[PDB]
Design a protein around this ligand. Structure first.
Ligand SMILES: O=C1N2C=C(c3ccc(O)cc3)N=C(Cc3ccccc3)C2=N[C@@]1(Cc1ccc(O)cc1)OO
Ligand SMILES: [Co+2]
Ligand SMILES: [Co+2]
Ligand SMILES: [K+]
Length: 185
């Protein structure tokens, strides 16, 4: 995994601007943790028929993850502050990675994969792409599976998706480009 960050690269800025705008469903330039956690729990976990325990675990992981980029309940965050939060989160996560401490993105991944049970099939990923809305095109979800190193069944493991996520969200690793097909630049 490419470990050096690239926070001034316009492509890294654009990646997160795309995601911010995707979360800013009402187009008012600000998002809150409340909205993110409702998306996680009331929308995604409900549609995935997660158990109450799984929903709660996933919520704790989403809360931790987005608190790591500066989000908080009731705190209206616009994109520049959000991105500064992501620089902090990425930095912290890479330190955890280096010291063999589980990352917040790994723990969120554990919670997502457990709802789908540490492997996800392509059909499960296609459903996630639609339900979370991050990648509603099934072709882009096929791209994810082509892109990643899959297990012997052609399923995706959380170790691999975690490595890919480090490169995609944190370091702009060329080896992670295309993780979400054309769904996320
Ligand atoms: O990584 C992921 N995400 C990153 C961002 C995101 C949001 C803002 C940014 O600036 C950058 C990235 N938004 C969402 C979708 C989501 C957002 C909010 C609440 C619930 C879900 C999202 N879903 C994940 C979940 C996941 C995590 C680990 C795995 O191993 C597998 C799957 O897979 O794509
Ligand atoms: Co394993
Ligand atoms: Co192999
Ligand atoms: K592959």
């Amino acid at each position: 995994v490419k470990l050096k960050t690239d926070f001034d690269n316009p492509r890294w800025i654009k990646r997160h601007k795309h995601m911010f705008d995707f979360l800013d469903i009402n187009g008012n330039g600000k998002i809150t943790l409340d909205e993110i956690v409702s998306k996680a729990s009331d929308d995604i976990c409900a549609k995935l028929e997660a158990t109450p325990e799984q929903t709660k675990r996933h919520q704790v992981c989403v809360e931790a993850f987005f608190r790591g980029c500066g989000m908080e309940y009731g705190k209206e965050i616009a994109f520049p502050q959000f991105l500064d939060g992501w620089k902090q989160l990425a930095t912290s996560e890479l330190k955890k990675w280096a010291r063999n401490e589980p990352t917040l993105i790994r723990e969120w991944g554990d919670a997502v994969f457990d709802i789908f049970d540490g492997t996800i099939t392509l059909d499960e990923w296609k459903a996630y792409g639609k339900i979370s809305g991050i990648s509603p095109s099934q072709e882009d979800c096929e791209a994810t599976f082509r892109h990643c190193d899959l297990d012997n069944a052609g399923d995706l493991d959380v170790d691999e998706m975690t490595r890919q996520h480090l490169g995609f969200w944190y370091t702009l690793d060329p080896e992670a480009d295309g993780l979400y097909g054309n769904g996320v630049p």
